[PDB]
Amino acid sequence: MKIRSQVGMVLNLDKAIGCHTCSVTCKNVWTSREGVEYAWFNNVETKPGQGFPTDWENQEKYKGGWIRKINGKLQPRMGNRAMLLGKIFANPHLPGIDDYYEPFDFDYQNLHTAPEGSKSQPIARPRSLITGERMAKIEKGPNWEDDLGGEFDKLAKDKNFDNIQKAMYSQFENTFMMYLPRLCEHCLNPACVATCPSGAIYKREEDGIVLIDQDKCRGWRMCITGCPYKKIYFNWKSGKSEKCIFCYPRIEAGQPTVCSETCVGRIRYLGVLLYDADAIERAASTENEKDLYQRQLDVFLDPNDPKVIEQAIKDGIPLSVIEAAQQSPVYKMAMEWKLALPLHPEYRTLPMVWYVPPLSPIQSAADAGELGSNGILPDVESLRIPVQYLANLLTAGDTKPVLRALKRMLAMRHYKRAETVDGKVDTRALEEVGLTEAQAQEMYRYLAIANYEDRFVVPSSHRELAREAFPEKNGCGFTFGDGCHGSDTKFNLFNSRRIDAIDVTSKTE
Amino acid sequence: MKIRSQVGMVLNLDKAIGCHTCSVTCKNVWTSREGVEYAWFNNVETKPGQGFPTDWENQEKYKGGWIRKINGKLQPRMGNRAMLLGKIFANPHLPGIDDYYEPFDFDYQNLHTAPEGSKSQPIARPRSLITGERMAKIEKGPNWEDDLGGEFDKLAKDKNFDNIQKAMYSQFENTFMMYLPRLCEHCLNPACVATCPSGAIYKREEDGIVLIDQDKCRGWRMCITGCPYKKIYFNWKSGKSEKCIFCYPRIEAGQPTVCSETCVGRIRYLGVLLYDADAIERAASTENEKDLYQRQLDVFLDPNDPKVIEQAIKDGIPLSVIEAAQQSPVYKMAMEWKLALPLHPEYRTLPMVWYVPPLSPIQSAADAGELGSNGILPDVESLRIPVQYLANLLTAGDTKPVLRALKRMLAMRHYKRAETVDGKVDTRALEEVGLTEAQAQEMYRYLAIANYEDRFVVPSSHRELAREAFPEKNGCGFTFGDGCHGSDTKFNLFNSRRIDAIDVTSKTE
Amino acid sequence: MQFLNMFFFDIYPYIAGAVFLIGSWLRYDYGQYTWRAASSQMLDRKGMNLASNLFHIGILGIFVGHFFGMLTPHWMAAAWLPIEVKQKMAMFAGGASGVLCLIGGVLLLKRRLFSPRVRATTTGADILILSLLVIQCALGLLTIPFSAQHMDGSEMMKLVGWAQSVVTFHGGASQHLDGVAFIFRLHLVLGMTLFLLFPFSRLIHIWSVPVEYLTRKYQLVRARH
Amino acid sequence: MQFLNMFFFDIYPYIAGAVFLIGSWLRYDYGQYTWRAASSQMLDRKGMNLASNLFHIGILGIFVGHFFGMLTPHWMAAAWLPIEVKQKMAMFAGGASGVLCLIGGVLLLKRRLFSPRVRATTTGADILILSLLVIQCALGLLTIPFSAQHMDGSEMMKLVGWAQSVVTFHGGASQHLDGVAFIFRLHLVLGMTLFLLFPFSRLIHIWSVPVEYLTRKYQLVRARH
Amino acid sequence: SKFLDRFRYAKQKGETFADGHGQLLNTNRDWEDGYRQRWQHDKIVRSTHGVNCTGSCSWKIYVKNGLVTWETQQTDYPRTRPDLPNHEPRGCPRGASYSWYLYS
Amino acid sequence: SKFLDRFRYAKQKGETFADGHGQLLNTNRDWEDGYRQRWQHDKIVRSTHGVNCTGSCSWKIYVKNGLVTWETQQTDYPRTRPDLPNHEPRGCPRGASYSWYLYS
Ligand code: HEM
Ligand code: HEM
Ligand code: HEM
Ligand code: HEM
Ligand SMILES: CCCCCCCC(=O)O[C@H](COC(=O)CCCC)COP(=O)([O-])OC[C@@H](O)CO
Ligand SMILES: CCCCCCCC(=O)O[C@H](COC(=O)CCCC)COP(=O)([O-])OC[C@@H](O)CO
Ligand code: SF4
Ligand code: SF4
Ligand code: SF4
Ligand code: SF4
Ligand code: SF4
Ligand code: SF4
Ligand code: F3S
Numbered sequence A, B: 001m002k003i004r005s006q007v008g009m010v011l012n013l014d015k016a017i018g019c020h021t022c023s024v025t026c027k028n029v030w031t032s033r034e035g036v037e038y039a040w041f042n043n044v045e046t047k048p049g050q051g052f053p054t055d056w057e058n059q060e061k062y063k064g065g066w067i068r069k070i071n072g073k074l075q076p077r078m079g080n081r082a083m084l085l086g087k088i089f090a091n092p093h094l095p096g097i098d099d100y101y102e103p104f105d106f107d108y109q110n111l112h113t114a115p116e117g118s119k120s121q122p123i124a125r126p127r128s129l130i131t132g133e134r135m136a137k138i139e140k141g142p143n144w145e146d147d148l149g150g151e152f153d154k155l156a157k158d159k160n161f162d163n164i165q166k167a168m169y170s171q172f173e174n175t176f177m178m179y180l181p182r183l184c185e186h187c188l189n190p191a192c193v194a195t196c197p198s199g200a201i202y203k204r205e206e207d208g209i210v211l212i213d214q215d216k217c218r219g220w221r222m223c224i225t226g227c228p229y230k231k232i233y234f235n236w237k238s239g240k241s242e243k244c245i246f247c248y249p250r251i252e253a254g255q256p257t258v259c260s261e262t263c264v265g266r267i268r269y270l271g272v273l274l275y276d277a278d279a280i281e282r283a284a285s286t287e288n289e290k291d292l293y294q295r296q297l298d299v300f301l302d303p304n305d306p307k308v309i310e311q312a313i314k315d316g317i318p319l320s321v322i323e324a325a326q327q328s329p330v331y332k333m334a335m336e337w338k339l340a341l342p343l344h345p346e347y348r349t350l351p352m353v354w355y356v357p358p359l360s361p362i363q364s365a366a367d368a369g370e371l372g373s374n375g376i377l378p379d380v381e382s383l384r385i386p387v388q389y390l391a392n393l394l395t396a397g398d399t400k401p402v403l404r405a406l407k408r409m410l411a412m413r414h415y416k417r418a419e420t421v422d423g424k425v426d427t428r429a430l431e432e433v434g435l436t437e438a439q440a441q442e443m444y445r446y447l448a449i450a451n452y453e454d455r456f457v458v459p460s461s462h463r464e465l466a467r468e469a470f471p472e473k474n475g476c477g478f479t480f481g482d483g484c485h486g487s488d489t490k491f492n493l494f495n496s497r498r499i500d501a502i503d504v505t506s507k508t509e
Numbered sequence C, D: 001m002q003f004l005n006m007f008f009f010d011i012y013p014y015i016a017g018a019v020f021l022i023g024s025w026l027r028y029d030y031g032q033y034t035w036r037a038a039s040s041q042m043l044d045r046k047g048m049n050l051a052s053n054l055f056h057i058g059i060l061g062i063f064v065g066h067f068f069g070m071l072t073p074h075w076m077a078a079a080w081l082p083i084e085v086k087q088k089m090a091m092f093a094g095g096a097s098g099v100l101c102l103i104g105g106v107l108l109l110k111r112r113l114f115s116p117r118v119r120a121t122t123t124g125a126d127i128l129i130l131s132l133l134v135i136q137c138a139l140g141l142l143t144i145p146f147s148a149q150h151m152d153g154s155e156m157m158k159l160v161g162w163a164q165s166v167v168t169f170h171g172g173a174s175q176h177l178d179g180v181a182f183i184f185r186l187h188l189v190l191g192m193t194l195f196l197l198f199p200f201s202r203l204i205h206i207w208s209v210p211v212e213y214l215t216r217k218y219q220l221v222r223a224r225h
Numbered sequence E, F: 001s002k003f004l005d006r007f008r009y010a011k012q013k014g015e016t017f018a019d020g021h022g023q024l025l026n027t028n029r030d031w032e033d034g035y036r037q038r039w040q041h042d043k044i045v046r047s048t049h050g051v052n053c054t055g056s057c058s059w060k061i062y063v064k065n066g067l068v069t070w071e072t073q074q075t076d077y078p079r080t081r082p083d084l085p086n087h088e089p090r091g092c093p094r095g096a097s098y099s100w101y102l103y104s
C-alpha cells in the first residue's frame, strides 16, 4: 500500500461537438515549432475512422501496449528488454511520417509578389515543411476523416468494428458518427516508460503526469511504438521525442490544462484520483482483459475514507490534494455514477483519461415508434450507435458497463423531464438503473449546469515541498546561462554558480 | 541629422511622497538574487543627504561623468582611453560595498527552533549576506538618511549645499526635506558606454534604452566609476555589472515600466522624445555647463513639425512612435511648459529622466504674512526650500529655470483657485509667467487629474521590424538548451539547430 | 617524412584523444539537448531496416575486434592466442564485419544524399561523419590483402605495438610502425581523426549504449526534487 | 625516468595545449555568462591597488619576456641578440618582473584566504589557480641561480630548443632538455599544467585584454537585430 | 556537473513499488523548466473577434517576448441564474487560430 | 558560433554618428532574452491585503514557476467623475513587499 495522487480527466462524449478548439489551443502553445508541426498532442477524430496516426488502434500492426504472458507476467507487446534492444538500429514497427501526414504550408507571398502582366490570377500552392519542395497535391492531413470524410468501406476499417456485422451501417438511413478527442492518458502502468532504453520517461510522483526528459532522452525512438495510443511524437528536428505534458506548468498552481479550460463543449472534467501504486502490476496483469476496467477501479481509493486519508498523509499527499480528491468530479463519474470508462483498457496501461459514452438519435424503424420506458425520450435499446462499437472502444468488448452508463444518462433525463415539464416526481427510470434522486440531481449539477468550479477541481502540485522555493522565487527566469542548472553536484567546468541559489552559507547555523 | 526616439521619463517632485513603493517593486522583480541584493536599480533618497552610494554626487571623489578639455573635446572624468586602461588592474575610484551598505538578513529560524528552557526570550539577530557571519550591529542601509535621519552637520555634507550658507537650515523653524527618487537616466551621451573597455554597454537604437550585455560584459568594473549617477551596480557573485533596464520587456509592447505603473504618488510620466543623434556631441561639449540644459532641449525635435515627421520616417521611426511623440506628456513638460528639468546636466551625459522641482511650505517669517501676488497661496519667493539648492541639483546652479518652473506651478494654482472658488477668470498670475489659459488647463489635466492614459504614452518597440517574429512567436520560451542562441553564424560545435528557427529552406523561392 | 611520421603517430593521437574526451565531457554537461541519435527513420523508412542493421552489426563487430585485437596484452593467453591467430581472426571475422558495415554504410549514405526528406533535413556533420566512416571501412578492408602478405602476423605486431604504446603513454610509439604498409598509415590517421571529430558529431550516441535497460525495473517514478 | 621524460615533455604538452584551445572555444561559445574577470575589489578594497598592480604588471612583464624569449627564432637578429644576451635580459628584467609578480601574488593570496568577505565569496578554483601561479612564479625565480651557473646561455638554449620543437610540432622535443637542471623541469610542467587548467578557471579573462578600446568610438548604439 | 551526477547512480534510487514492477527515483528534474518558460508570458489583454460568426467571445490575448503568441478564452462573463449553465468558455476552433495572422 | 561571430567584427559596423563620437553596430542582441524571461509569468491573480492600513488596494499577484513571485497594483478600479482624479494605482511600500512572506 503506497498512495499517490493524480489529476485524472473525464471527457463527456455525449456533449462532444467535435470542434477541435482543444487541438488548436494546444498546438499554438506547445507544438508550433519546426520538428513537431505535424504533432498534435491533443487531436480529435471522427468515428468510424482509422485516426491519427492511421490505424493507431491496430496493435497487431503497431505493437503498442502490454501483453500478459502465459506465466502471468507482463511484457511490452514490442518485446522484452533484449527483444527491444535488438530492434534499436531500426525500429521495425515505427510509424512513418506518412502514417501521420506530410506537414505543409502555402506560398502566400506569391499572392503579394506576383509580377505585373501575369497570364492568370496568382495563387498560393502547397509546399512541404519537410523538404521545402512544391507539393503537387495535399493527400493527407491529421483530421482527414472529419465528419465521415471518405468512403464507408475505408472508414469502416476502423478497428472498433471488429466482431460487428457492419454492412447495415453503410446504408444512408443508418448513418452514425461521433467524436473522440484524445491526448496522452498519463497511465498508471505506461507502456512508454517501460519501452524507453534510456529511462528518460517517468511518471511524476506528486501528480502522476508522465514526461519525457528532454535532457536525458537519447532519441532511441522505441517509446513511440510502445505507446498503444500513439501519443508520443518524434521531433524530427531535435531528434528527441515529445508528448502531451498535461500542461504541468499550469496544473502545478491549480489551473486546468489548456485543452480543458478551452473546451467549448464543456465536456472535460479534471479531478484528483488517489491510487495504490503497489497494486498497479497486479491490476494490469489480470488474466481476462474484460476485468481490467474493474481492476483499475479497485486501485482507486475512497478519498472520504479516514483509513485512506490517514495513509495518504503518511505517504506524503498534501492536505489540499486530499481535500480536492474529496470533491473530485472525476471520482464521482468513474467510481460513484459509473458514467466514465477507460479508453482501451485492454492495452493494460491503466489509462487515466476516461470517457462517458455518447447518446445518439434513435435508430431507423418501421414507424414513428411508441412511448417507451422513458416516455417520449429514448430507451437505451433504441440508440443508433451500436453499443458493441462503444464497448470495443471503452470496455474491451463488454457491453454491460457501456449500457449502464448510457441508461443512467437517459434515466436522469427521464427523471428531470417529469420534474421540469410535468412538475412531478418520477423515479421509475432511476430505480431501474440503481440511482437515487440525490445521485441524479448531483449528476445533473455536474453534467448539465457544469459550473467552472465543478468542472475543474485541480489542487496545487505544491512546488515548495521538498525544495527551496524562496531562492527560486527570487532568481528563476534570469536565463543568462549560468550553466549550473540540471545537476545536484555543484562542481562545473566553467567555474560558475547557480543564479537562483545561495552560495554564501550561513555561519550562524 | 539622424533622428532616433526614446521613451523619456519625468518625475514630479512636487507630488512625491517618498514612499519607496517604486523601489520595492523593482527589487522584487529584478534584483532579489544573491550578488545584487544590495543593488537598488530604483532608489529613493531624502534630501538634504549624501545618498546611495554615499556622496555619489561628489565627482571629484568618484570621478563620474565627462569633462570638457581646454581644446573643447570631451573626455570621461575617469580618464581618456589609455588612462582608463592603466587603471584596470585595480579601479582606484571604485565604490566599495560599505559605500552602499553591507547587505543583511536575520536569523528568523532561531524564533522557531529555540530550545526548551531558554534563559531569555529568543530573538532574530542580523547576519551578513556577504560572509554569512553574525553582525554585532547594523550600521548602514540603502535608505539610512530617510526623513532627515542623522545629524544636520552630517546630512548637510550634501553636495548640493555647495555655495550656500547652510547654517540657517540647521534651525528647527527652518527645517526642510524633499524626496529624490531615481533610476538610470538612459542618457543620450552615457558615460558608462564610453568607459567600458569591452564595449559591452550600448544604447538601443529603437528606444534608447541603455543596457549592459550580460554575455559580452567581462567584469572590468570601470563603467561603475564612469556613471556619475552611480546607477550601475556590480553583481559581486556573477562578476558582471547590472543596471536599470528601463523594464524593456514591458516597454517593448507599450507598457509602463514597473516603477512607473506602481508609483503611488502618481508622479511619473512616460512619453516619447525624438532627438537628433548627430547633435549629441555638440550639445554635450558646450563650453558653459549652465548651457547644457538648453543645449539638450535643442537636440529634442518637434514631433508635430512635418519636417521632423518626414525625416523621422526616412530614418526608420515607426508611425506609432511618431504618433506617441505627438501626445507625449514628457515633451509637454520639458519643452512646452518648461516644468521638467534634467538631473545634474553638468555631468554632460544628456540625461533622459527629468524632474519637476517641488514646492514647499512658506518660510519662517516675523508675522503670519500678507496676501501676495497669488492671494492666500504662496509666491515663489516665500518657499522654504532654497532655490539655489534645487538649481545645484537640476540646472548646474542657474536658478532662473527652477524659478520659472516653480512660479508656473504656483500660477496654475492661483488661476484654478479663482476659477473653482471665486467662479471668476483671473489670468494675472499666468500672464506674469507667460502661460495662456489653454496651457494652464492642459497642465492641470496632466498634473492634477493625471488619468492613466495621460501619464503613460508608451508606444511599442515593434520587435517585428527587421526581425522574424513568426518563428519567434512559435518557438520562443522552449528553453531546452539548443546552444544556438546568441550568434548569427549557424555553425555550432554541438551540431544542433535553433529551436525557434526554420532550418528547412523553401525551394519554391 | 620523419617529421610527419612523429606528428601523426606520436603527437596527433594525443591531440585527438584529448579533444575526444574533454569534448565529450563538455558537450555532455552543456549540451544534453544536443545529445541524441538523430534518427531519420520516420521521415523515410525505406531501406533503413536492412541498411542500419547491416551497418551497425558490422561496425560493432569491428569495434569488438579492434578493441581486443589492439588492447589485449600479448602475455594474456599468449600460447592460445598467438599474434598470427589473432590476425586470422581479424582478417576473416573482421573482414566479414567490415563487408556488412560497408554495404550498410553505402546504403545509408546513398539514402542521406538522395532521399529528398532525409537530404533536406540533414546537417552537414551527418554527411561528413558517415562519408568518413564509409571511407575508413573501405580503407580497412583494403588492408586485408596487405596483411595477407605477412600471415606470420609481423605487420599486426607493429600496429598493436604502436596502439599499446599510445594508450599507455609510452613515447616513441611511431617507431613500432617502421616499414608497415602505407595503407595502414592512412587507416590509423583517419581512424584517429574520427575520434577528434567525434564530440562534434552524432557519434556521441555511442556513449549512450543502453546497457542499464537490460536490468532496469519497468516503471520509473521521479519524486519531488 | 625516461618514460616520465617523454610523457611530460613530448606528450603532456599537446594534451595541455589541446585542452587549452578547445576548452577556451567551448567555454566561449557555451559559457559567455561565466566569462568574466571576477573582480572582488568592491567587497574589500584594502590593499588591492598595490597587490593587483604589482601582480599584473609583474606577470605581464614575465609574459612578454617568455613570449619573445622562447618563441623568437635564433636567426632573427642573431648577431645583436645572441642567446647569452637574451639570458641576461631574462635574469635581470624577467627576475625583476618575477619579484613584482610574486609580492603581488602573495598579497593577493593572503587577501583571498584571510579577508572574510573575499574568502566567503571565493570559488575553490580561484584559490587553486592563484596558489599555483604563486608557486610557479617562485619556481621561476628559483631557476635564476641555476641559470647563473651557465652564463654562456647553454641551459637557455636547451629550454628554447624544447619550446620551439613543441610549438612547431617537431617530435623528440624532450631530447633538447638533456642534462638541464631539475628545477627547470618542474617549472615547465607546472607551467603547462596552468594551460591545462586555464579554460576551467578565471584565467579566461586574459583572452579578453581590451585592445580594441584604445581606438573605439566612444558611443555605441545597437540597431534592431 | 551532469556528468558527475551519473556517479550518484544507485545513490538516487528510492523504494521499489508494485513488488518490483516499479522504482522510485530521487533525481534532478530541473529540465522541466523548459516547458514552464514557454507557457510564461508578458501579459494578457482582453479582446475579441471582429468576424461575422455571432460568437462574440472574449479572449485572453497572450503577449510574450513583446509579441502576440496565442490566445485562450476568458471565463469571467457575469454568471447566469443558478438554474442555467454559464456561458464560459465560449470560443471555437476558428477563433483559437487568429493569432496566426499577425506575423504570418 | 559566438566565437566565429567575432570574425564579422568590422562587417557588423554601421554608420558613425555625431561626427565620429558614435558608432551604430549591427550585432546580435539575443542575450536580451535573459531579462525578458524573468518578467514572464504563469498568470496574475487579483488579491488584496488583510492588514489594518485603510488602503484596501487591489493587486495583481504574479505566479511564475508555479510560485508567487511578486506583485504590482491593479489599475482597473471603476473611474471617478471626469473632474476628479482616479484611484489607480493605490498601493504602498509595505504592500509591495508582502510576497516576501510566502516562503520566507
Ligand atoms: C550499440 C551501440 C549503438 C546504438 C544503440 C546505435 C543506435 C543508433 C540509432 C538508433 C541511430 C538512428 C537510426 C535511424 O535513423 O533511425 C543510429 C545512427 C547512426 N549510427 Fe549508431 N548506434 C550505435 C553505435 C554506433 C557506432 C559504434 C557507430 C560508428 C562509429 C555508429 C554510427 C552511426 C551513424 C553514422 C549513424 C547515422 C546513419 C545515417 O547517416 O542515417 N553507431 N545509431
Ligand atoms: C582510431 C581508430 C582505428 C584504428 C587504430 C584501427 C586500426 C586497424 C588496424 C591496425 C587494422 C589491421 C589489423 C591487423 O593488423 O590484422 C585495421 C583493420 C580494419 N579496420 Fe580499423 N582501425 C580503426 C578504426 C576503424 C573504423 C572506425 C572502422 C570502420 C569504419 C574500421 C574498419 C576496419 C576494417 C574493415 C579492417 C580490416 C579487417 C580487420 O582487421 O578487422 N577501423 N584497423
Ligand atoms: C592585460 C591583461 C589582463 C587584464 C586587463 C587583467 C585584469 C584583471 C582584473 C580586472 C582582475 C580582477 C581584480 C579585482 O579583484 O578587482 C584580475 C584578476 C586576476 N588576474 Fe588578471 N588581468 C590580465 C592578465 C592576467 C594574467 C596574464 C594573469 C596570470 C596568468 C592574470 C591573473 C589574474 C588572477 C590570478 C587574478 C585574481 C586575483 C585574486 O585572487 O584576487 N591576469 N585580472
Ligand atoms: C608553459 C608556461 C611556461 C614556460 C614554458 C616557462 C619557461 C621558463 C624558462 C625556460 C625559464 C628560464 C629562462 C632562461 O632559460 O633564461 C623561465 C623562467 C621564469 N619563469 Fe617561466 N615559464 C612558464 C610560465 C611561467 C609563469 C606562468 C610564471 C609566473 C607565475 C613564470 C615565471 C618565471 C620567472 C619569474 C622566471 C625567472 C626569470 C626569467 O627568466 O624571466 N613562468 N620560465
Ligand atoms: C573523461 C570524460 C568523459 C565524458 C563522457 C561524456 C559521456 C557520458 O558520461 O556518457 C555515458 C556513458 O559514459 C560513462 O559513464 C563513462 C565513464 C568515463 C570514462 C552515458 O550517459 P547517458 O546519459 O546516455 O546514460 C544513459 C543510460 O541509460 C545508459 O545505460
Ligand atoms: C582556437 C580556438 C580559440 C578559442 C578562443 C576563445 C576566446 C576568444 O575568442 O577571445 C577573444 C580574443 O581571442 C581571439 O580572437 C583569438 C584568435 C584565435 C587564436 C576575446 O573575446 P571578447 O568577447 O572578450 O572580446 C572583447 C573585445 O572588446 C577585446 O578587444
Ligand atoms: S498514453 Fe501517455 S502515458 Fe500512456 S503509454 Fe502512451 S505516452 Fe505513455
Ligand atoms: S493537457 Fe496540455 S499538453 Fe496535453 S493535450 Fe491538453 S493542452 Fe496539450
Ligand atoms: S545614468 Fe544610466 S545611461 Fe547614464 S551614465 Fe549612468 S548608467 Fe549610463
Ligand atoms: S525602469 Fe524598471 S528596471 Fe529601471 S528602476 Fe524602474 S522598475 Fe527598475
Ligand atoms: S472564438 Fe469563434 S465564435 Fe467566438 S468570436 Fe472568435 S471566431 Fe467567433
Ligand atoms: S498596498 Fe499598503 S495600503 Fe494598500 S492594502 Fe496593501 S498594505 Fe494596505
Ligand atoms: S525511447 Fe526513450 S530515448 Fe527518447 S525517443 Fe523515446 S524517450
Ligand code: F3S
Pocket: A011, A015, A016, A017, A018, A019, A020, A021, A022, A023, A044, A181, A262, A263, A264, A265, A266, A267, A268
Ligand atoms: S472537440 Fe470541442 S467539445 Fe471540447 S473536447 Fe475539443 S473543445
Ligand code: F3S
Pocket: B195, B196, B197, B198, B199, B200, B201, B212, B216, B217, B218, B219, B220, B221, B222, B223, B224, B240, B241
Ligand atoms: S566596464 Fe564593461 S566589462 Fe562589464 S563591468 Fe562594466 S560593463
Ligand code: F3S
Pocket: B011, B015, B016, B017, B018, B019, B020, B021, B022, B023, B044, B181, B262, B263, B264, B265, B266, B267, B268
Ligand atoms: S517614492 Fe512613492 S511617490 Fe512614486 S516615485 Fe516612488 S512610488
